Design a protein around this ligand. Structure first.
Ligand SMILES: OC[C@H]1O[C@@H](O[C@H]2[C@H](O)[C@@H](O)[C@@H](O)O[C@@H]2CO)[C@H](O)[C@@H](O)[C@@H]1O
Ligand code: BGC
Ligand code: CA
Ligand code: CO
Ligand code: CO
Ligand code: ZN
Length: 528
C-alpha cells in the first residue's frame, strides 16, 4: 500500500496532485526534507477506491516529504521539473538513428556504430536502393513510412507551438549537420531525409516500409543485424501520409533549410499526383515479409490529411474543394497512427481564412469542440482525471492518452479554448510518470519506479543494465497480446494490464510515434 504520484515532479505554478487507496478522508502534509511542515489539506474521494490530495497552492520549489496516514513519498517542485525528461524524450529519436555512428560523447553507455548501411531490394525485383538514416521505428529495426509520418508531424507541431520550451533542450548535436536548427526540427530532419529516399522517382508513389524479411532475436545489436533489407511495395497509406508530412515540412523548414523545404514541397506534390492516379488499396505484407504490417482498411482520413496539408502549404483556395467534402465525413478525428483525420483538421483550421469557407470552418470548429467535450466527460469521471475508459487501454494506450491531451492543446492554437485543456495535460503527465494503479512510471530512466526491461533490442542486446533512457512505453493493454501478458495478467483490470518485461511487446515496447506526442504534451506544460 502506497502513495501514487508524479514521480518526475511538479511545476512551481502548476497543478499538484497525489493519490492513495482509502475509504475515507485523511489529512496530509508536506514538509521540507529536514522536518518543517509547509502545507496541509484533506484527501477527498474521486471514484472507486481512490482519494486524491491536492497541493497546487505550494509554490515554493524543493524536494518535500509527503505524509498521509503512515505512508511517505518524496515529491519534487521545480520551475522546470520536466526539462530533463523532455530532453530525454527528444534524444530518444537520436538513439533510434539508423546508419550513423552514435558516438560515446553523445550516447554514453548506449553508443554504437552505423547499422543497416547496405542497400534495400525493391520487393520482387533486382533493384537496389539506398534508404539510409531515419529512425528504428520501435523495439525492432524497421523503418515504416506510415508511423514515421505521425512522429514527424508531432515534432513539427511541437516546434510550431512550444519553441520556447524546446529551446532549452539539447539533442545529440554532434551527429547532425551544421548549421544547427531548433532542437525539434534538428531531430526531425533526420527522418525527413530518410523519408525522401522512399519516394519512387518513376511514379511518385512511396514504399510502405524498408525492413529485413523478419525480426531478428531480441538479443541482436543494431550493428550485428546482418539480414538483407527489403522495400515492401508502394502503398496508398504510405504515399498519402508521406505527402502530408512533407507538405508540413515544406512550411516549417522554409526559414531554416530552404533547399529542404522546396524539395519536400515538390516531393509532396508528386505523391498527391500518385494518389489521384491510384486506388485506395489497403497494404498487406507480401509473402516472405513478417515485420510489422501497419495496415488500415480506411484510407480516406489519409487523403484528408494530404489534401489539407497541401491546402496549408500552398494557401490556394483551389484545395478547399477537395478538403471540405472529406471534412464532412464521419471519420474519427484522431492523431494517428492509422486514424489521422485530426491532423487534416488542424492543417485546414490553420490555413488562412481567405482560402476556406467561414461556414465550414465553424462547423469544423463546432465538431472539434464537441469531441473535446466527450473527452472531458471521460476525464471528469476517471479517478486520475485522464480522458480514458477501460476499453481505451489497448496496444499503445499511453499514445492514446497522450494523443488526446494533444488534441485539447492543438485546439488552443485555433481558438477552441476548452477549459479542461491544461488540467488534462497535467493529468496525462502525472499518469505517465506514475499516477496510475501500478504506480508505474512509463518512461525508462525516470521516477522511482521506472521502466527497467523494455522490449527494445538495443537495451536488450547491449550489456548495460539500465535501458536507453527517455523511452515512453506502450502501456497497459487489456487484450493481452503477447504470451507473457496472457501468462501474468489474465483477470487484471484494464489499467493494470501492463508488465515490465522485455518479451511483453504488447505492453512494454517503445516507438517513435509514442515518444512524439509525449514530447508535444510535456513541451506544452513546460511553457506553463
Ligand atoms: O499491429 C499490432 C500493433 O502494432 C504496433 O506497432 C508495432 C509494430 O507493428 C511492430 O513491427 C514493432 O515496430 O513494434 C510496434 C509497437 O509495439 C502498433 O503501435 C499497434 O497499434 C498495433 O496494434
Ligand atoms: O507482432 C509484433 C512483434 O513481434 C515480435 O516478434 C517482435 O519481437 C516485436 O518487436 C514486434 O513488435
Ligand atoms: Ca486511416
Ligand atoms: Co541493456
Ligand atoms: Co550479449
Ligand atoms: Zn539501423
Amino acid at each position: 500500500k502506497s502513495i501514487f504520484y508524479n514521480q518526475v515532479g511538479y511545476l512551481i505554478s502548476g497543478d499538484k496532485r497525489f493519490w492513495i487507496q482509502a475509504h475515507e478522508p485523511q489529512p496530509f502534509a508536506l514538509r521540507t526534507p529536514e522536518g518543517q511542515a509547509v502545507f496541509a489539506g484533506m484527501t477527498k474521494p474521486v471514484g472507486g477506491n481512490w482519494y486524491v490530495g491536492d497541493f497546487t497552492a505550494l509554490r515554493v520549489p524543493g524536494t518535500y516529504t509527503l505524509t498521509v496516514g503512515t505512508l511517505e513519498a518524496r515529491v519534487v517542485i521545480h520551475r522546470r521539473a520536466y526539462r530533463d525528461v523532455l530532453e530525454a524524450m527528444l534524444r530518444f529519436f537520436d538513439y533510434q538513428l539508423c546508419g550513423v555512428v552514435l558516438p560515446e560523447d553523445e550516447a554514453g553507455p548506449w553508443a554504437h556504430g552505423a547499422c543497416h548501411t547496405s542497400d534495400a531490394k525493391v520487393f520482387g525485383t533486382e533493384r537496389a536502393l539506398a534508404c539510409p538514416g531515419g529512425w528504428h521505428d520501435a523495439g525492432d529495426y524497421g523503418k515504416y513510412t506510415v508511423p514515421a509520418a505521425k512522429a514527424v508531424a508531432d515534432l513539427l507541431l511541437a516546434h510550431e507551438y512550444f519553441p520556447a520550451a524546446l529551446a532549452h533542450v539539447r539533442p545529440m548535436r554532434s551527429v547532425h549537420r551544421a548549421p544547427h536548427l531548433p532542437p525539434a526540427l534538428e531531430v526531425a530532419r533526420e527522418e525527413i531525409a530518410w523519408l525522401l529516399t522512399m519516394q519512387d522517382p518513376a511514379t511518385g508513389g512511396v514504399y510502405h516500409k524498408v525492413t529485413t524479411p523478419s525480426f531478428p532475436p531480441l538479443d541482436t545489436r543494431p550493428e550485428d543485424d546482418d539480414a538483407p533489407l527489403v522495400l515492401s511495395p508502394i502503398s496508398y497509406a504510405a504515399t498519402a501520409t508521406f505527402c502530408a508530412a512533407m507538405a508540413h515540412a515544406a512550411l516549417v523548414y522554409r526559414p531554416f533549410d530552404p533547399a529542404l523545404s522546396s524539395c519536400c514541397a515538390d516531393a509532396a506534390r508528386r505523391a498527391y499526383a500518385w494518389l489521384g492516379a491510384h486506388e485506395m488499396q489497403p497494404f498487406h505484407n507480401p509473402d516472405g515479409i513478417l515485420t510489422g504490417e501497419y495496415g488500415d482498411a480506411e484510407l480516406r482520413d489519409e487523403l484528408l490529411w494530404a489534401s489539407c496539408a497541401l491546402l496549408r502549404m500552398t494557401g490556394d483556395s483551389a484545395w478547399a474543394r477537395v478538403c471540405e467534402p472529406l471534412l464532412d465525413l464521419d471519420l474519427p478525428w484522431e492523431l494517428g497512427w492509422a486514424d489521422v483525420a485530426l491532423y487534416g483538421v488542424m492543417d485546414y483550421l490553420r490555413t488562412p481564412r481567405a482560402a476556406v469557407s467561414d461556414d465550414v470552418r465553424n462547423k469544423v470548429k463546432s465538431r472539434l469542440l464537441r469531441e473535446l467535450d466527450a473527452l472531458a466527460a471521460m476525464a471528469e469521471s476517471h479517478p486520475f482525471g485522464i480522458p480514458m475508459r477501460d476499453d481505451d487501454f489497448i496496444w499503445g494506450s499511453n499514445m492514446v492518452l497522450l494523443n488526446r491531451a494533444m488534441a485539447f492543446l492543438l485546439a488552443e492554437g485555433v481558438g477552441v479554448l476548452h477549459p479542461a485543456a491544461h488540467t488534462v495535460a497535467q493529468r496525462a503527465a502525472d499518469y505517465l510518470f506514475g499516477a496510475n494503479p501500478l504506480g508505474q512510471c512509463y518512461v525508462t530512466g525516470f521516477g522511482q519506479r521506472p521502466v527497467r526491461h523494455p522490449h527494445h533490442r538495443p537495451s536488450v542486446a547491449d550489456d548495460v543494465d539500465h535501458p536507453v533512457p527517455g523511452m515512453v512505453v506502450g502501456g497497459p493493454n487489456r487484450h493481452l497480446q503477447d504470451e507473457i501478458a496472457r501468462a501474468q495478467l489474465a483477470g487484471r483490470p484494464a489499467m493494470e494490464a501492463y508488465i515490465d518485461h522485455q518479451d511483453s511487446y504488447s505492453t512494454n515496447e517503445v516507438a517513435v510515434y509514442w515518444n512524439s506526442p509525449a514530447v508535444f504534451v510535456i513541451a506544452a506544460l513546460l511553457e506553463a
